[PDB]
Amino acid sequence: LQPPPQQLIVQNKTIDLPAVYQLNGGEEANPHAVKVLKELLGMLISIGEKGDKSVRKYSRQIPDHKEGYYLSVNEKEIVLAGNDERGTYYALQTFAQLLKDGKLPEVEIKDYPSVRYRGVVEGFYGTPWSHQARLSQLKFYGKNKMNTYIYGPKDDPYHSAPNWRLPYPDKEAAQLQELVAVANENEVDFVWAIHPGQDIKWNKEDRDLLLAKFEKMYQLGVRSFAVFFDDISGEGTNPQKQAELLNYIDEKFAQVKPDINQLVMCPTEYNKSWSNPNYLTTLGDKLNPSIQIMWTGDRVISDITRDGISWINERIKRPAYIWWNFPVSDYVRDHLLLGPVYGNDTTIAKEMSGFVTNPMEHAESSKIAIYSVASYAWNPAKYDTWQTWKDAIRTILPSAAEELECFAMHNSDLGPNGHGYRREESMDIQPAAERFLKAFKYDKADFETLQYTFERMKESADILLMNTENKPLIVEITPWVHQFKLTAEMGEEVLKMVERNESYFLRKYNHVKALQQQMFYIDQTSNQNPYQPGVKTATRVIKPLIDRTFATVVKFFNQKFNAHLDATTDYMPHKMLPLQVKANRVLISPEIELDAIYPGENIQINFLSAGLQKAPVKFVRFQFVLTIEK
Ligand SMILES: O=C(N[C@H]1[C@H](Oc2ccc(F)c(F)c2)O[C@H](CO)[C@@H](O)[C@@H]1O)C(F)F
């Protein structure tokens, strides 16, 4: 069961889903839950909300919590009783996971979430989620009892700079309208956010335009709203004016419409490190208390701790609404972040108004963290990092679960980055790895372990590429899967170099250099975004072991045979601190000879620049970056 319920009593007896049933309360229960029931489908089945005729017999069993439910299955009768309509739907989501092979376990469940708002903020920089991916997201939220979707992609020009003042065009508006309908069907609050701050004026004209935009969104069906003031400079960062604007939205709009739910703001000082030592106490004191204030923790990317959440709560005078910056990867775009969700304290549910997760631009790939966050935020006390990661992967790709686990286990670290934020990766093999190298610079078992791992990586790569159960997932990860397969091939060849004769070693060597060039070409042709282009994989443990083992066994060959083989581990056609090639930049990692003559563009230097005006260039002699026409 995911999320695991607050309370559960299992009897050890089984019951056939009744071939013949009597439905009580289907005309009065939450239509969204009734629809799920009738699809899954004499024995009495009672569905309803506390107060309904159908479930009055169980009124004492129903948890007195928002979104709570009582679920019961026995030989005699089935009860599916929400404390409110969402609760009934959540009872159904649990019910569907009990139903296996046409059979049900005899169980009594009393359930409710520990955190009031739980979900995803699409708030990353980069390519926003497609329409299809958002639709699929919303269904997945409902299955996993996430009730919050904060729409806020940084690069949607109608969400942020400069066209936040304009209504969405017809096509986009028709799409959002559908998203809102689908969200409603899955018991998700669609929260449309706006990000006006970089150029907002504190006047009537901009105040009114912002309210007019919210009204347009409201006409599209939107019933929750957010205003983000993060990552901005200038007058838009003034706390009094922020609070005043939010209170004005609250009082003229959120409390005037009959049916507005969440009103949320993201502060400019949204993590402890970025907070000056009185912006936050001004917000805490001036902002209407029903208004939510977001917070990403001690740092832009951090895990939430008891000390950290108590620090925020005291300044803002309400429980912080957490924006958790994982698995967002818009600052490490060359990595996928498919590891487990961990690091957040599991005893601080009462200290938070909400918990949402900023995910990767890769929507399906994000379902691993998302499913885990859902589990954490509903039942933090029973949150099991590893089992939930395994369950996520198995729900997302039942046909190739083991292969996805293999891929995901070696694609979880961010690599070095400006935020200093890291994740564990490849922990199972790390001991055999680190002992194999030390000895080299070995136990047979460690060698076979590495060998087993490479073999497995290839099996996983090839089965994943060809999987048809979740095609959109496979499209997202495909470039990394190719790179992952290459890595495992390079690993097998390097191990063969460690093991017979001069001639066989040179065959393996030459095959390695070819594999290095293949990885380079995948890195230059896939995922060519402006910020961190290319495709890295297995970066924490595996690639480093392979490269170092390669440097080492070559060194020993040159010593033994008086040879002069090149020991370089990453292919690089240009010559010169490694050179890098990023799009049409050739740069010295913070005399260069290129592999051919190109038209030059510019040379940028920091210890400065010169335009080259398309002059032909092969040699550059003196950041340190050459930009060519390519
Ligand atoms: O996290 C937030 N905002 C952005 C914030 O973005 C930054 C933008 C500029 C920075 F200099 C910086 F250090 C972080 O961090 C996330 C990760 O990159 C982004 O995805 C978010 O859109 C929000 F809580 F304020």
Q: List the domain boundaries for the chain.
A: 1-112, 113-396, 397-630
> In angstroms, what CA-CA distances link 435 with 430, 447, 537?
8, 10, 22
Cα 316 to Cα 299: distance, rounded to the nearest angstrom: 17
The residues assigned a catalytic role are: 231
For residue 533, report the distance from its CA to the centre of ligand 1, in Å: 19
Closest residue to atom 8 of ligand 1, CA basis: 231
Q: How many CB atoms lie within 10 A of CB 615?
A: 10
Q: Which residues of 213-246 are buried (b: 16+ CB within 10 A; e: fewer)?
A: bbebbbebbbbbbbbbbbbbeeebbbbebbbebb
Q: What angle do the packed helices 367-378 and 131-143 form, to 10 degrees? A: 30
**Residues with C-beta less than 6 Å from any ligand 1 atom:** 123-125, 154, 230-231, 266, 270, 294, 296, 300, 323, 325, 328, 330-331, 358
Closest residue to atom 10 of ligand 1, CA basis: 231
Is residue 330 a known part of a binding site?
A: yes
Q: Which residues of 56-75 are buried (b: 16+ CB within 10 A; e: fewer)?
A: eebeebbbebebbbbbbbee
Atom of ligand 1 at shortest range from CA of 295? 24
* Cβ contact 520:465 at 8 Å: no
Please provide residue 159's backbone torsions phi and psi, each rounded to the nearest 5 degrees: -90, -40
> Amino acid letter at 439?
A
Question: What is the CATH code of the structural domain delimited by 397-630?
Answer: 1.20.58.460
What residues have CB less than 8 Å from 503, skipping those under 6 apart?
none
Q: Which of 344, 405, 347, 374 is nearest to 97 (CA)?
A: 374
Atom of ligand 1 at shortest range from CA of 331? 18
Cross-strand partners of 627: 585, 602
Is residue 21 a known part of a binding site?
A: no
Helical (H) or strand (E) element with 111? strand 103-111
Please provide residue 381's backbone torsions phi and psi, each rounded to the nearest 5 degrees: -60, -25
* Cβ contact 104:98 at 8 Å: yes
> Amino acid letter at 54?
S
* Cβ contact 606:625 at 8 Å: no
Q: How many CB atoms lie within 10 A of CB 478?
A: 14
Query: What was the structure determination method?
Result: X-ray
User: Going by DSSP bridges, is the β-strand pair 592-605/579-582 parallel, antiparallel, or unpaired?
Assistant: unpaired
* Cβ contact 410:457 at 8 Å: yes
Q: Is 204 left (phi over 0), alpha (psi -120 to 50) or beta?
A: alpha
Atom of ligand 1 at shortest range from CA of 124? 20
Cα 343 to Cα 210: distance, rounded to the nearest angstrom: 38
> In angstroms, what CA-CA distances link 559 with 497, 538, 553, 565, 574?
15, 30, 10, 10, 27
For residue 367, report the distance from its CA to the centre of ligand 1, in Å: 21
Q: Is 283 exposed, middle or buried (0-12, 13-18, 19+ CB in 10 A)?
A: buried
* Cβ contact 239:279 at 8 Å: yes
Q: Is 79 left (phi over 0), alpha (psi -120 to 50) or beta?
A: beta
Is residue 324 a known part of a binding site?
A: yes
Q: Which of 178, 87, 194, 198 is nearest to 132 (CA)?
A: 178
* Cβ contact 232:198 at 8 Å: yes
Please provide residue 620's backbone torsions phi and psi, each rounded to the nearest 5 degrees: -120, 120
What residues have CB less than 8 Å from 276, skipping those under 6 apart?
269
Is residue 323 a known part of a binding site?
A: yes
Cα 86 to Cα 599: distance, rounded to the nearest angstrom: 63
Is residue 413 a known part of a binding site?
A: no
* Cβ contact 4:391 at 8 Å: no
For residue 407, report the distance from its CA to the centre of ligand 1, in Å: 28
Q: How many CB atoms lie within 10 A of CB 416?
A: 9
* DSSP per residue, 194-220: E--TTT--SSHHHHHHHHHHHHHHHHT
What residues have CB less than 8 Å from 307, skipping those under 6 apart?
none
Q: Which of 324, 364, 375, 341 is nearest to 93 (CA)?
A: 375
Is residue 123 a known part of a binding site?
A: yes
Q: Which of 320, 31, 323 is nearest to 184 (CA)?
A: 31
CATH class of this structure's domain 113-396: alpha beta
Copy the structure tokens of residue 200. 């907002």
Tell me the CATH number of domain 1-112, given options 3.30.830.10, 3.30.379.10, 3.40.50.300, 2.60.120.380: 3.30.379.10
| Probe residue for ligand 1, chosen from 300, 302, 335, 532 as the CB with the greatest number of ligand atoms within 8 Å | 300
For residue 163, report the distance from its CA to the centre of ligand 1, in Å: 20
Copy the structure tokens of residue 388. 């939930």
Q: Which of 210, 198, 196, 190 is nearest to 252 (CA)?
A: 210
Angle, CA of 260, 262 and 265, to the nearest 5°: 125
- Scan for tokens 């056609």, then name that residue: 573
For residue 300, report the distance from its CA to the centre of ligand 1, in Å: 6
Query: Longest Cα pair distance anywhere in the chain, in angstroms?
Result: 90
Cross-strand partners of 23: 45
| Probe residue for ligand 1, chosen from 127, 358, 366, 417 as the CB with the greatest number of ligand atoms within 8 Å | 358
- C-alpha distance across the termini of the chain, in Å: 53
Q: What angle do the packed helices 471-498 and 542-561 form, to 10 degrees? A: 30
> In angstroms, what CA-CA distances link 549 with 5, 54, 307, 322, 451?
48, 69, 43, 43, 13
Closest residue to atom 7 of ligand 1, CA basis: 231
Bond into 544 cis (ω within 30): no
Cα within 13 Å of Cα(448), Cβ side: 3
Atom of ligand 1 at shortest range from CA of 266? 25
Please provide residue 493's backbone torsions phi and psi, each rounded to the nearest 5 degrees: -70, -40
User: Going by DSSP bridges, is the β-strand pair 352-357/320-324 parallel, antiparallel, or unpaired?
Assistant: parallel
* DSSP per residue, 56-104: GGGGGGS-SSTT-EEEEE-SSEEEEEESSHHHHHHHHHHHHHH-BTTEE
For residue 393, report the distance from its CA to the centre of ligand 1, in Å: 27
Closest residue to atom 2 of ligand 1, CA basis: 230
Q: How many CB atoms lie within 10 A of CB 315?
A: 20
Q: Which of 332, 329, 336, 333 is nearest to 411 (CA)?
A: 336
Q: Is 343 left (phi over 0), alpha (psi -120 to 50) or beta?
A: left
222 alpha-carbon distance from chain centroid: 24
* Cβ contact 275:310 at 8 Å: no
Q: Is 625 exposed, middle or buried (0-12, 13-18, 19+ CB in 10 A)?
A: middle
Cross-strand partners of 609: 604
Torsion angle of alpha carbons 405, 407, 409, 414, nearest 10°?
-140
Q: Which of 281, 285, 202, 191 is nearest to 237 (CA)?
A: 202
Q: Is 257 left (phi over 0), alpha (psi -120 to 50) or beta?
A: beta
Q: Which of 311, 220, 303, 227 is nearest to 263 (CA)?
A: 227
What residues have CB less than 8 Å from 539, skipping those under 6 apart?
335, 413, 415, 425
Is residue 303 a known part of a binding site?
A: no
For residue 122, report the distance from its CA to the centre of ligand 1, in Å: 12
Bond into 258 cis (ω within 30): no
Atom of ligand 1 at shortest range from CA of 125? 20
